Design a protein around this ligand. Structure first.
Ligand SMILES: CCCCCCCCCCCCCCCCCC(=O)OC[C@H](COP(=O)([O-])OCC(O)COP(=O)([O-])OC[C@@H](COC(=O)CCCCCCCCCCCCCCCCC)OC(=O)CCCCCCCCCCCCCCCCC)OC(=O)CCCCCCCCCCCCCCCCC
Ligand SMILES: CCCCCCCCCCCCCCCCCC(=O)OC[C@H](COP(=O)(O)OCCN)OC(=O)CCCCCCCCCCCCCCCCC
Ligand SMILES: NC(=O)C1=CN([C@@H]2O[C@H](COP(=O)(O)OP(=O)(O)OC[C@H]3O[C@@H](n4cnc5c(N)ncnc54)[C@H](OP(=O)(O)O)[C@@H]3O)[C@@H](O)[C@H]2O)C=CC1
Ligand code: SF4
Ligand code: SF4
Ligand SMILES: [Zn+2]
Lengths: 53, 442, 51, 118, 169, 338, 49, 172, 44, 198, 98
């Protein structure tokens, strides 16, 4: 992909990271849902932030 | 002059502490009891170093359910509610309501048009509204004295209201098919011309402390700038639309004109920068043009030429006739064309005619009957395009009446043009948008 | 140097998320040229009938 | 034409002008007028109750325009400030005494207004 | 003494309605949906012709005409999916209407103003002195005042309305 | 005479309950609450008063106990003319007397005037008017003919006089009443705020108290009006539990987190200084005298349970009135958001 | 005098002679604002009555 | 997440740190957020009753998590405990159990979130918002109560209790 | 036309040269005069 | 009449699957056209309007709704034909109307949508026109309209801690609650109201 | 990236920075977004992950149970809670001493 480093474009998808890198669920939610949050879903990261605080 | 763009804006990135909010934001109530919030505005404001970032305008603190009430009364009983919509410019609201009712009736008010009263008083309330708006905006910016002058010069217009209806603000003057002809006298127009002559001087007095002031220019220039695209997206009309560059005046529109405006000769002004300075200048020039329109109307109801002697070309002035006192006869056009209707109205009332007494009884007990249908009628009010969309089911009460107010759209666009500005800039912007919460909340 | 910390991740954000479609949160400040606000000359465009 | 404090008028003989037609009650946009009528023992139709809530009134003058005998009017008085909310509950005694006190000025103004069409 | 025409005879209450069929609907779909044919007899010349004649006699339009009713414009040229030239005709008509509706406004649109603008410029202490029209307005106001003053001074008195309690017998 | 009083309590501010009431001595602490309890169901309330400052909130807010056309405030009351008493209760079928000797007062003659003379006049006016059904007279729990406090002695004498003049009157003897504007918790807070380091105590704090919330006295009044068997009875109103003054100090300290500190001054010095110097709300003989006396339900008369009222506990009912004066010590970060 | 002082008209009352104002037999004398006095306006059913 | 409930909308622990060093964190669930809510988008449409029930359960869970904060900031903790408030609002929801239109349920969930946000930001008054947390057949805990009508009308049915106590004023 | 020259709707058309002179300024502002004068005077 | 007028017929040319029903009236301005639009095409139609040439220079002027469940002709019941737009007010639970102005064509366009579902659901267009945010919020709170895919669904003009649709015909103009000060709580409360009647 | 976007690149042009960073509206979403079947937030499918990891996943059993329950109960009577007064279950606020 031009101007995207080592990120590759596959079939049906542009790709969001370098090959063999872990896909992030929060960024997936950000891309798919721009500003829509049906509810405050408590993931592992949110619970960890709560525990840290 | 080097680039300082990175110092200007700060984005956010997921899970980036340096890109996030590294501070507790100042969440303040720009609440109703604030000098710059007008009466009922409760604006939840997020400040970061006195920079407005997030807006949450809470409105409805002056919502009185006026449309439901209007739907619950006969047509004439709801009309004074319009007086309480945009209580700075009163007769424009009545004019819009009466235009809607007349359109539903399929007729026109010839007695109002041939006397030029509606155009004249529309321009007078235009002067009232712009005087109040400019004075209050200057007071918000910091100029304290200018508010004392516009209020004295808008006391004379309040007296002009009081001389035709007996009220200073809520006239309830315009009626769907009736004009109180006896309320208008020639002695009133001469005082209006006197007021215009002195209003020139008072407007110049306000002119020379604000227009060329360096502080005023640095406070208003390049503040709240927007182009025609935003001006269309947010439904901006009136002075704001003329500042964004668009040529939109309902009085001068071929298919949308009303009440003698199409057959006068006046100018309208458009800005070329779309900021607060343009709006201020446009309001001053609109006041001047309103003076010009009033003068033209008075000329149209005036009798200039006289009878001269056959020899020596010497005028023969009357001695006992009323025309000797003044050249203004506010009934010469109406009596010239609609002589039959003029004669009947001046001879028969509800004290010596059976039909007229029956009409009076029905009118004041049940109201007039309006044939079923839908109408939408808009008017160039001093604050923008003010409209009424109303549907009637054939009874003496409106089935639905919806009020289109431009102050609501201006308040809606205010957060768009206020983000990134200082608190003082936000106060100045609230001043520049001529918003009244009686019209917004209704 | 202190201000440089924010700029580190800005290029990746602008290249991975579309600015006009992804609703990116940000804050900014507007600046006015003081000199340009002092020598500005007031004027307006007057519109008239078709003539 | 100034719209001030409401009053009930009389004929020059002292008879009440109001004949309890209830046109002023239905003309009121604020529903501030309440009227109840019974036949007076001499036979004439007069109100046994005529009261106006001055805290509901919008001082619009629709009621004085609706009256066909010029019974209810809005006078020139505006110094009607009260200390109690109950002082603004106007009954027939208050309106009648207001008419009996302000009759000369109201008569002069109405005389000019009547002569205007003539 | 003339009372027969105190009420308006002609009033502006007229309403005009236009109803059209879907543009993408073909002739066979229109014939089937209107109860002049059935799905079985499709793709048969005799059935199509019979349905077309029945439509043309029961309805006032051809089966290829999608204008159910047109009171607004009384158009005789339907816009149909099959006839591509009708789309070009509509585009030409709409562009001509654009030009003509913008060529009829007396104030809103003016190419001469776009090429030869007239500006108001603030230059003096007097806002009126920057425009000859406002100066003319001020002079006219002074002229009217002077005429009123001289006309009233010539008469020497002023009739007035004086109250009369004899009015209230 | 008839003690029957039929009224409709299922209404609201704009309803008609059927009660026309006159309340004496409503310019104190009980007044607004009793008036609101009566006028919130649609009653007519009249407040006779002679208050030194007419612009004080103690008079104006009495207009809020009922709506427009329901509450009336009678000013410049003589408290000495029989005609004014007759005018006050002319159309009232319920009369409530909250007049009593004020805390600042230390004069025996003024105490008798407040507790005996005014109550006697009210009861005599009630007896003359045949349309009065119920009269409720407010007394003190520790009232006694041998009390060292002139207030309690004169209140016992007033009980005797009222029961003599109007034998169908109901006597209420609250123990001690706390609320937003009271002389129990508000005085504690203000004394600690002024004497920043301590609360002044002039005894061993072994006197017993039975606090009762103000919202329960109003309910007791309403229940007594609803009960026809309470016409000529005496009721003592107190809370569920009895505490000593030291226990009350400790409980107030623990509920708010302020560490207690009771500076002790010998009784005789305090008595002499309050006797020979000017007295006001926060410095008077009445506090010194009453701090050695028990104001509790003695069991000789009927109690709050006979009015079918369940009072709230002092720790539970007093907590909301000290929320603003809570001790700000070591707290979590989430407590910064308010 | 109220109408004269507010510039409603140019007529003013006179003790004797030709008057511009009616003088009926049922007229009452002008009184000042009587609120906050023992002679205020009381509705017929108000508790003050 | 550009939303009021986003995981980055927490109040920083200190002026120089979001949390302690070596890590980040913040509380956004049991207390209010850092920035104010500027928009509340529509709930995604629910095609069946299962999605609507899930939305109701999640709204109730958020409300239960926010109860102690509301009770503390509104000074209403003496009238009832957190569990009592949860039970009263659950009684409200149970009285709304018969609903079967998913779109209506989405609308109700939007309104519930709006009212909860109003409560947690001091937009409403405590004496006004307590109408949703008050008990249905029990006295409030901050004041005494009268049991007069319990003693007099002991074993009498509801009809007799409503007959002895009228439904209109008796003077008129 | 009431907004253009030589309009019959206008009334004050005859010789009003004295009034026009009295009511309106008779001198034109020229840029730099005040600036140069004030700066030179301040330096001196 | 006495002015250049043309129907907005290209809208139904592009959307070939839609019936066309348009009205012009002398009770409206001579450049005002009213059309009927189905609910399941409203978002696509607004998408087409916002960007198509000679439509792109458009602004949304007004938005509101009509409760037609209680709409009845009161006079002249025998002067109704099949072409009257009011003929579409019968048996229809809800109506929604939008009013736009086009600067290029100098035209007013009103679009009417019939809502016949009990939950009153329709797609929002506030993502296309920035006007529709506050307008649609007020319409939704007044008439109970359920707007889907809306930017902000919060109440705009109504009081806190209340759920009601006061502009429905079933609603009485006096409401169901009144606000009073409570002495026992030292704050304002809401109670069931008893009101005067004329 | 900023120059490609169209941001100001000079000191004088910064006075109009907002016109290029805020005044441009976001593009409306495509209708295919509204025509979707599921709108749950995305999460990793833990089919091959161990059972301990599977506990942190969407509970499909609850969905199935709710679907079955709503199939069995398509219409129910509205629940009414009696407002008749009763003695409190928790009597501590009126019984506690400390
Ligand atoms: C109290 C004091 C003031 C009382 C009078 C107030 C009054 O009438 O004010 C208006 C009066 C008229 O000026 P204006 O209203 O600006 O005229 C505008 C016209 O459009 C004309 O525009 P213009 O810019 O061509 O004006 C002509 C110009 C005339 O100036 C010149 O002719 C400049 C001559 C030098 C040119 C450069 C060479 C320098 C070396 C020699 O006038 C001035 O420069 C005015 C004086 C400026 C401030 C001086 C302060 C002195 C302390 O101005 C003054 O009085 C200003 C103060 C003068 C103080 C005394 C100077 C001797
Ligand atoms: C202001 C300048 C001015 O007029 O100054 C006064 C000056 C005369 O005074 P001076 O120079 O002190 O001579 C001794 C007599 N006083 O005046 C003069 O000498 C007139 C010429 C001054 C030239 C320089 C101005 C600066
Ligand atoms: N609150 C408590 O803790 C308890 C109170 N009580 C008693 O209950 C009654 C009501 O309580 P509360 O409101 O708190 O008491 P207050 O002391 O606050 O109020 C006393 C009332 O009586 C009036 N009053 C006092 N002296 C005179 C006088 N000489 N002539 C006329 N009026 C007078 C006062 O009016 P003003 O001074 O303005 O003229 C005021 O309205 C009192 O008798 C009190 O002793 C009994 C037990 C406990
Ligand atoms: S309008 Fe006049 S005549 Fe009729 S009831 Fe009223 S006061 Fe009487
Ligand atoms: S002036 Fe108007 S509002 Fe007042 S009582 Fe008369 S009709 Fe009613
Ligand atoms: Zn003794």
């Amino acid at each position: 992909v031009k101007g995207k480093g080592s990120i590759r474009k596959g079939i049906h998808g542009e790709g969001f990271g370098a090959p063999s890198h872990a896909h992030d669920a929060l960024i997936h939610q950000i891309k798919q849902s721009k500003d829509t949050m049906d509810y405050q879903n408590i993931t592992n990261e949110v619970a960890q932030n709560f525990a840290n605080h | 002059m080097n680039r300082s763009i990175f110092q200007l804006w700060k984005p956010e990135s997921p899970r980036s502490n340096v890109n996030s909010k590294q501070i507790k934001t100042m969440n303040v109530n720009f609440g109703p009891q604030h000098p710059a919030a007008h009466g009922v505005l409760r604006l939840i404001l997020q400040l970061n170093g006195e920079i407005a970032e997030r807006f949450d305008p809470h409105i409805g603190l002056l919502h009185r359910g006026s449309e439901k009430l209007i739907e619950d009364r006969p047509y004439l009983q709801g009309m004074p509610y319009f007086d309480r919509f945009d209580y700075v410019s009163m007769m424009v609201q009545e004019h819009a309501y009466c235009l809607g009712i007349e359109s539903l009736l399929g007729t026109t008010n010839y007695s109002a048009t041939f006397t030029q009263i509606r155009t004249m008083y529309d321009e007078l309330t235009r002067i009232l509204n712009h005087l109040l708006a400019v004075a209050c905006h200057a007071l918000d910016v910091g100029s304290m004295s200018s508010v004392f002058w516009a209020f004295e010069e808008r006391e004379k217009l309040m007296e002009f209201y009081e001389r035709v209806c007996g009220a200073r603000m809520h006239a309830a003057f315009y009626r769907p098919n009736e004009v109180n002809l006896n309320a208008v006298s020639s002695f009133l127009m001469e005082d209006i011309l006197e007021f215009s002559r002195n209003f020139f001087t008072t407007l110049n007095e306000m002119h020379n402390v604000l227009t060329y002031n360096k502080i005023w220019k640095q406070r208003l220039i390049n503040i709240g700038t927007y182009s025609f695209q935003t001006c269309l997206d947010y439904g901006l009309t009136g002075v704001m639309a003329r500042s964004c560059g668009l040529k939109r005046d309902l009085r001068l529109s071929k298919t949308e004109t009303y009440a003698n405006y199409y057959y006068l000769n006046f100018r309208s002004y458009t800005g070329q920068h779309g900021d607060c300075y343009d709006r201020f200048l446009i309001r001053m020039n609109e006041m001047c043009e309103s003076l010009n329109i009033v003068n033209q109307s008075i000329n149209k109801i005036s009798k200039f030429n006289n009878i001269v002697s056959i020899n020596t070309k010497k005028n023969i002035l009357n001695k006992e006739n009323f025309n000797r006192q003044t050249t203004v006869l506010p009934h010469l056009v109406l009596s010239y064309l609609n002589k039959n209707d003029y004669n009947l109205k001046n001879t028969k009332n509800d004290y010596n005619s059976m039909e007229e007494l029956i009409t009076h009884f029905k009118y004041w007990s049940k109201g007039l009957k309006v044939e079923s249908g839908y109408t939408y009628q808009s008017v160039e009010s001093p604050k923008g395009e003010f409209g009424v969309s109303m549907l009637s089911d054939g009874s003496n009460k409106p089935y639905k009446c919806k009020v289109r107010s431009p102050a609501l759209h201006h308040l809606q666009v205010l957060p768009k043009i206020g983000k990134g500005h200082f608190l003082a800039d936000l106060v100045a912007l609230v001043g520049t948008v001529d918003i009244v919460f009686g019209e917004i909340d209704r | 140097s202190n201000k440089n910390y924010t700029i580190v991740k800005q290029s990746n954000l602008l290249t991975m998320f579309d600015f006009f479609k992804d609703f990116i949160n940000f804050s900014f400040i507007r600046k006015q040229d003081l000199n340009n606000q002092t020598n500005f000359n007031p004027s307006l465009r007057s519109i008239k009938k078709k003539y | 034409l100034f719209r001030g404090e409401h009053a009930l008028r009389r004929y020059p003989t002292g008879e009440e002008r109001c004949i309890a037609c209830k046109l002023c009650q239905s003309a009121c946009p604020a529903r501030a007028i309440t009227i109840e009528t019974e036949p007076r023992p001499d036979g004439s139709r007069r109100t046994v109750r005529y009261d106006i809530d001055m805290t509901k009134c919008i001082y619009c003058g629709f009621c004085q325009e609706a009256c066909p005998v010029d019974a209810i009017v809005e006078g020139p008085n505006y110094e009607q400030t009260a200390y109690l909310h109950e002082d603004l509950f106007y009954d027939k005694y208050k309106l009648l005494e207001n008419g009996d006190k302000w009759e000369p000025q109201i008569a002069r103004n109405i005389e000019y207004l009547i002569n205007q069409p003539l | 003494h003339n009372i027969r025409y105190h009420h308006e005879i002609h009033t502006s209450d007229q309403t005009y309605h236009s109803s059209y069929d879907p543009v993408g609907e073909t002739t066979t779909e229109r014939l089937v949906r209107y109860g002049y044919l059935n799905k079985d007899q499709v793709n048969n010349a005799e059935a199509v012709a019979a349905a077309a004649k029945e439509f043309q006699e029961k309805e006032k339009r051809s089966p290829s005409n999608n204008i159910i009713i047109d009171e607004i414009s009384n158009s005789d040229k339907p816009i149909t999916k099959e006839n591509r030239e009708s789309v070009a005709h509509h585009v030409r008509q709409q562009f001509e209407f654009f030009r003509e509706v913008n060529a009829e406004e007396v104030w809103s649109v003016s190419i001469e103003e776009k090429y030869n603008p007239e500006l108001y410029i603030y230059k003096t202490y007097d806002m009126a002195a920057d425009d000859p029209v406002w100066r003319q307005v001020k002079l006219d106001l002074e002229w009217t005042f002077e005429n009123i003053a001289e006309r009233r001074e010539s008469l020497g008195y002023m009739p007035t309305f004086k109250g009369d309690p004899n009015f209230w017998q | 005479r008839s003690t029957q009083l039929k009224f409709y309590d299922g209404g609201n501010r704009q309803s008609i309950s059927g009660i026309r009431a006159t309340i004496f001595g409503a310019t104190g602490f009980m007044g607004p609450y009793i008036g609101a309890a009566l006028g919130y169901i649609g009653s007519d309330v009249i407040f006779p008063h002679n208050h030194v400052y007419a612009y004080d909130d103690y008079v104006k807010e009495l207009k809020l106990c009922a709506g427009s056309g329901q509450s009336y405030i009678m000013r410049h009351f003589n408290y000495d003319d029989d005609n004014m008493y007759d005018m006050a209760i002319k159309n009232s079928n319920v009369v409530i007397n909250l007049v009593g000797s004020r805390l600042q007062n230390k004069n025996f003659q003024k105490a008798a005037y407040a507790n005996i003379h005014v109550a006697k006049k009210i009861a005599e006016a009630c007896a003359r008017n045949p349309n009065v059904r119920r009269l409720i007279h407010f007394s003190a729990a520790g009232a006694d003919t041998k009390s060292p406090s002139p207030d309690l002695h004169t209140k016992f004498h007033g009980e005797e006089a009222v029961l003599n003049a109007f034998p169908n009157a109901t006597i209420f003897r609250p123990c001690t009443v706390y609320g937003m504007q009271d002389y129990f918790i508000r005085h504690w807070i203000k004394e600690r705020d002024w004497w920043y380091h301590f609360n002044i105590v002039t005894d061993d704090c072994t006197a017993k108290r039975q606090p009762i919330l103000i919202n329960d006295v109003a309910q007791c009044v309403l229940n007594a009006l609803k009960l026809q068997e309470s016409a000529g009875q005496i009721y003592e109103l107190g809370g569920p539990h009895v505490y000593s003054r030291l226990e009350v100090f400790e409980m107030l300290a623990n509920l708010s987190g302020r560490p207690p500190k009771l500076a002790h001054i010998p009784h005789d010095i305090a008595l002499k200084i309050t006797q020979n110097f000017y007295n006001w709300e926060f410095f008077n003989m009445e506090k010194v005298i009453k701090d050695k006396l028990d104001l509790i339900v003695t069991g000789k008369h009927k109690t709050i349970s006979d009015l079918y009222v369940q009072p709230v506990s002092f720790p539970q009912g007093a907590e909301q009135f000290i929320d603003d004066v809570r001790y700000r010590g070591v707290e979590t970060h989430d407590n910064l958001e308010k | 005098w109220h109408g004269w002082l507010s510039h409603q008209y140019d007529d003013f009352p006179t003790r004797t002679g030709n008057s511009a104002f009616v003088k009926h037999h049922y007229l009452k004398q002008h009184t000042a604002n009587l609120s906050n006095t023992p002679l205020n306006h009381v509705p017929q059913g108000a508790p003050q009555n | 997440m550009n939303h009021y409930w986003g995981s980055s909308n927490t109040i920083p622990a200190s002026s120089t740190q979001n949390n302690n060093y070596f890590s980040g964190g913040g509380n956004n669930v049991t207390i209010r957020g850092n920035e104010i809510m500027e928009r509340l988008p529509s709930q995604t449409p629910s095609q069946n009753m299962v999605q609507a029930s899930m939305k109701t359960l999640r709204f109730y869970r958020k409300f239960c998590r926010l109860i102690p904060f509301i009770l503390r900031i509104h000074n209403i903790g003496t009238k009832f405990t957190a569990q009592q408030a949860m039970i009263n609002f659950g009684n409200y929801i149970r009285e709304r159990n018969h609903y079967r239109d998913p779109g209506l349920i989405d609308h109700r969930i939007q309104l519930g979130y709006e009212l909860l946000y109003e409560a947690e930001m001091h937009f409403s008054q405590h004496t006004i918002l307590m109408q949703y947390l008050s008990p249905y057949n029990t006295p409030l805990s901050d004041r005494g109560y009268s049991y007069l009508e319990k003693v007099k009308y002991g074993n009498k049915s509801k009809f007799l209790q409503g007959f002895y106590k009228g439904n209109k004023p008796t003077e008129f | 036309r009431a907004d253009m020259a030589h309009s019959p709707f206008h009334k004050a058309i005859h010789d009003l040269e004295d009034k026009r002179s009295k009511l309106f300024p008779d001198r034109r502002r020229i840029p730099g005069r005040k600036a140069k004068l004030l700066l030179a005077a301040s330096l001196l | 009449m006495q002015n250049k007028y043309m129907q907005p017929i290209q809208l139904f040319i592009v959307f070939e699957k839609l019936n066309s029903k348009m009205w012009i009236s002398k009770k409206l301005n001579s450049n005002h056209s009213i059309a009927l639009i189905p609910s399941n095409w409203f978002y696509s139609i607004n998408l087409f309007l916002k960007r198509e040439l000679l439509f792109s220079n458009i602004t949304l002027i007004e938005n509101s709704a009509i409760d037609t469940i209680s709409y009845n002709l009161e006079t002249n019941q025998n002067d109704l034909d099949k072409t009257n737009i009011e003929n579409y007010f019968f048996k229809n639970k809800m109506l929604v109307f939008y009013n736009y102005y086009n600067y290029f064509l100098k035209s007013k366009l009103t679009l009417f949508i019939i809502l016949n579902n009990l939950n009153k659901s329709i797609d929002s267009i506030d993502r296309i026109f920035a006007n529709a945010n506050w307008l649609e919020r007020e319409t939704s709170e007044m008439y109970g309209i359920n707007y889907k895919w809306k930017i902000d669904t919060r109440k705009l003009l109504l009081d806190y801690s209340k759920i009601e649709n006061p502009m429905l015909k079933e609603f009485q103009s006096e409401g169901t609650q009144d606000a009073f000060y409570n002495i026992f709580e030292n704050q304002v409360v809401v109670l069931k109201n008893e009101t005067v009647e004329l | 990236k900023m120059r490609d976007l169209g941001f100001p690149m000079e000191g004088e042009e910064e006075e109009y920075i907002e016109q290029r960073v805020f005044m441009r509206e976001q593009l409306p979403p495509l209708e295919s977004e509204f025509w979707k079947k599921n709108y749950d937030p995305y999460e990793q499918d833990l089919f091959h992950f161990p059972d301990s990891f599977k506990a942190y996943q969407q509970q499909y059993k609850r969905y199935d149970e709710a679907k079955k329950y709503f199939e069995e109960n398509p219409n129910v009577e509205a629940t009414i809670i009696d407002r008749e007064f009763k003695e409190p279950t928790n009597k501590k606020p009126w019984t506690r001493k400390y």
